[PDB]
Design a protein around this ligand. Structure first.
Ligand code: LS3
Length: 281
């Protein structure tokens, strides 16, 4: 703590406040996260600094002193939420959307292969730099330890306590649609409102499309029954390749939902390139 000179407060996270800080020693600029300490967390967090991938925000150090916990992450200047706000008028170019989705899927495939889940993916957690790269931040913290519910998977909202890697694919699918249309896909303001907004778009799930759904802890036979909408109306003007991938990312049944690995081979990415975005820092 004493070894860092806090510059600015980057923002309040799910498990603590994040500050832009300068390592008074090395002089390097980093992201200092003050965790708002169990031995389990310590061990879990420790394994995370071993995970290294170009599309994952690197956990540099873990400072456990005076019974306090500080996580030191690599620093990136902008998150996707701010970039989207800045591109509100023209929207993000499709080539850049495709590049970002491609890199994010690589990041997830890597984490998923190590059995590490994010569980709370959202625009605020996706950081970008001037080189055209995008990285996932806060990976694996959920397991170690006005909340947005917009990117929450159906199985989580229905009471399933043993979620899988599929929950991250759902969140990513929601973010994908948002970049294309420039509007949140399911902006619920409560757990039931979130669930109903999903049902009104993709249809109320039943035993046909999702075996075992009526046995979920929070499922109620009294749920209204809405018909499914066509994706052409939900995410215009995404082409057929894109709509195809999106539908596979938003399948109700977690077991039918596409994996990050398989999505990487989807036809939507046949013409992927790596454009450099115009960032205003
Ligand atoms: O560079 C960074 N590393 C991080 C590690 C974790 C988190 C985080 C998020 N929620 C909880 O934890 C964030 C970072 C991080 C931040 N850099 C950064 C730096 C500046 C700005 C933003 C983000 C947002 S903006 O409005 O675009 C300005």
């Amino acid at each position: 703590m004493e070894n860092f000179q806090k510059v600015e407060k980057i923002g309040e996270g799910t498990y603590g406040v994040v500050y832009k800080a300068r390592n008074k020693l090395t002089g390097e600029v980093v992201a200092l996260k003050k965790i708002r300490v169990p031995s389990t967390a310590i061990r879990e967090i420790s394994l995370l600094k071993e995970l290294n991938h170009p599309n994952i925000v690197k956990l540099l150090d873990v400072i456990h002193t005076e019974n306090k916990l500080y996580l030191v992450f690599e620093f990136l200047h902008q998150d996707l939420k701010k970039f989207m706000d800045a591109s509100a008028l023209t929207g993000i170019p499709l080539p850049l959307i495709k590049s970002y989705l491609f890199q994010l899927l690589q990041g997830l495939a890597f984490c998923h292969s190590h059995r590490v889940l994010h569980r709370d993916l959202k625009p605020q957690n996706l950081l970008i730099n001037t080189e055209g790269a995008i990285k996932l931040a806060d990976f694996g913290l959920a397991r170690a330890f006005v909340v947005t519910l917009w990117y929450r998977a159906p199985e989580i909202l229905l009471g399933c306590k043993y979620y899988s890697t599929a929950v991250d694919i759902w969140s990513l699918g929601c973010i994908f649609a948002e970049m294309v249309t420039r509007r949140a896909l399911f902006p619920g303001d409560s757990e039931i409102d979130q669930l109903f907004r999903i049902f009104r778009t993709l249809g109320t799930p039943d035993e046909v499309v999702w075996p075992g759904v009526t046995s979920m802890p929070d499922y109620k036979p009294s749920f209204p029954k809405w018909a499914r909408q066509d994706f052409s109306k939900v995410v215009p003007p995404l082409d057929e390749d894109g709509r195809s991938l999106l539908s596979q990312m938003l399948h109700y049944d977690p077991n039918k939902r596409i994996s990050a690995k398989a999505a990487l081979a989807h036809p939507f990415f046949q013409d992927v390139t790596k454009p450099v975005p115009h960032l205003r820092l």
